[PDB]
Amino acid sequence: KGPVPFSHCLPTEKLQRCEKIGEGVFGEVFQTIADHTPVAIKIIAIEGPDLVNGSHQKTFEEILPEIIISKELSLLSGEVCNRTEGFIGLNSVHCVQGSYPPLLLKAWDHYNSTKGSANDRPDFFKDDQLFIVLEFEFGGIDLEQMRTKLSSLATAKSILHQLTASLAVAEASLRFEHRDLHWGNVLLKKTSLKKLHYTLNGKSSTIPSCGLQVSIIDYTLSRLERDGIVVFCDVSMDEDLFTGDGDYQFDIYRLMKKENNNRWGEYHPYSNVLWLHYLTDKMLKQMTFKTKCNTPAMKQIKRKIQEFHRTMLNFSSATDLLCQHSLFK
Ligand SMILES: O=S(=O)(NCCNC/C=C/c1ccc(Br)cc1)c1cccc2cnccc12
Ligand code: NI
């Protein structure tokens, strides 16, 4: 069908309502509103020669795995045996050709002025520039931003239960490893549903939401397969990824590489356990809860999560943890 213009994705009224909501080396995320509902639009420059935010642009061959992975995981919400809504919904994906829209520069500048940006102002693109535009269902606010905003340790327990279940269903269905599930990639949004549902290998179960619905995002480093065909990001030659410091996060890259002996095509669902450990660590060390752990029931949930932190690395997959760990019984 050949690339489409930016107007195909952002008709004039959608485009007028865009406000920037996040960024990364990858590019830019804008929020717009259709039918009274927000959506998140990730715009990623590809195939061009310009350094963009200090890195070279991905080729189509290079951006395809994130595209494939985002579709697969979204489609889990419509499956039967292995079903979950725990990954971000993908409304659409297009390949767009043109220079960056002036109205998006406007929103970008407003962000820079109010929040600050690490990014180059994206105003240097020519009319042949290619982009991948991923429209996601709006997932809420990342766990790092919600650091100080979780009600209780029951909230933290629901979040870890949701994440474990999501990863398990994806493991069973797609032999999925997220491989970069830092706390910027766990989004939280209010839900009025008391219980959330997933189905794992045909068995349906429920999770108390504690008023939040968790969505997993960012598949830039992820791996999965369908019918024996593997899709992944080969970081075996990447130096930088495994020489970070200052946070347990950066240990996880090193620990994954130890587990997989630097063979990123292979399937090692222990990587999901590593990430869930990192996340459990954040829950217990870097969250300021809005309420106090001042009841016997809340004290017990705290001990359970501390037990989880101390034992979870002795399980083989998110599936194993979810099926066998005492925390979820
Ligand atoms: O606007 S976003 O980029 N919000 C998620 C990331 N928020 C910034 C966190 C960055 C970050 C990066 C690394 C670490 Br470690 C911690 C935080 C964003 C990206 C993709 C899909 C989205 C769906 N709904 C809402 C937002 C969506
Ligand atoms: Ni279209």
DSSP assignment of 115-131, as one string? T--SSPPS----TT-EE
* CA–CA distance, 58 with 218 (Å, rounded to integer): 15
The CATH number of the domain holding residue 185 is: 1.10.510.10
Closest C-alpha residue for ligand 1 atom 10: 184
Give the method of determination: X-ray
CA distances from 93 to 71, 205, 242, 255, 259 (A): 9, 31, 31, 33, 33
| Residue ranges around ligand 1 (CB below 6 Å) | 21-22, 29, 40, 42, 88, 136, 138-139, 142, 144, 182-184, 187, 217, 249
* CA–CA distance, 230 with 64 (Å, rounded to integer): 12
Closest by alpha carbon to 163, among 18, 303, 11, 308?
308
Which of 109, 138, 167 is the C-terminal boundary of a domain?
138
Triad 311, 317, 318: Cα angle to 5°: 85
Tell me how long the chain is: 329
Residues 169 and 52 in one domain: no
Which of 118, 138, 158 is the C-terminal boundary of a domain?
138
Instruction: Write out the two tokens for 299.
Output: 């004290």
Residues 132 and 152 in one domain: no
Catalytic residue among 180, 227, 247, 281: 180
Look up 240 and say whether it is catalytic.
Answer: no
Instruction: Enumerate the known binding-site residues for ATP.
Output: 21-29, 42, 137-142, 180-185, 218-220
Q: Are 32 and 39 in contact (CB under 8 A)?
A: yes
* CA–CA distance, 250 with 271 (Å, rounded to integer): 13
Closest C-alpha residue for ligand 1 atom 9: 184
Residues 6 or more apart from 248 whose CB is under 8 A from it? 278, 281
* CA–CA distance, 76 with 198 (Å, rounded to integer): 10
Residues 276 and 167 in one domain: yes
Q: What's the distance, Cα to Cα, between the start and end of the chain in Å?
A: 50
Q: Which structural domain, as residue segments, surrounds residue 33?
A: 1-138
Residues 310 and 234 in one domain: yes
Which of 81, 104, 138 is the C-terminal boundary of a domain?
138
Residues 109 and 169 in one domain: no
Residues 164 and 103 in one domain: no
Residues 312 and 182 in one domain: yes
The CATH number of the domain holding residue 69 is: 3.30.200.20
Residues 149 and 130 in one domain: no
Give resolution, Å, one decimal: 2.0
Closest by alpha carbon to 136, among 256, 65, 43?
43
From ligand 1's centre to the CA of 146, what distance in Å?
A: 12
Name the helix (H) or strand (E) containing 280. Answer: helix 270-285
Q: Which atom of ligand 1 is nearest to the CA of 247?
A: 15
Residues 273 and 157 in one domain: yes
* CA–CA distance, 242 with 252 (Å, rounded to integer): 9
Sign of the Cα torsion 268, 196, 226, 59 reads negative
Distance of CA 239 to the CA centre of its chain: 23
Phi first, then psi, for residue 105 (nearest 5°) are -55, -40
Residues 215 and 268 in one domain: yes
Instruction: Write out the two tokens for 325.
Output: 């760990």
Q: Which atom of ligand 1 is nearest to the CA of 138?
A: 24
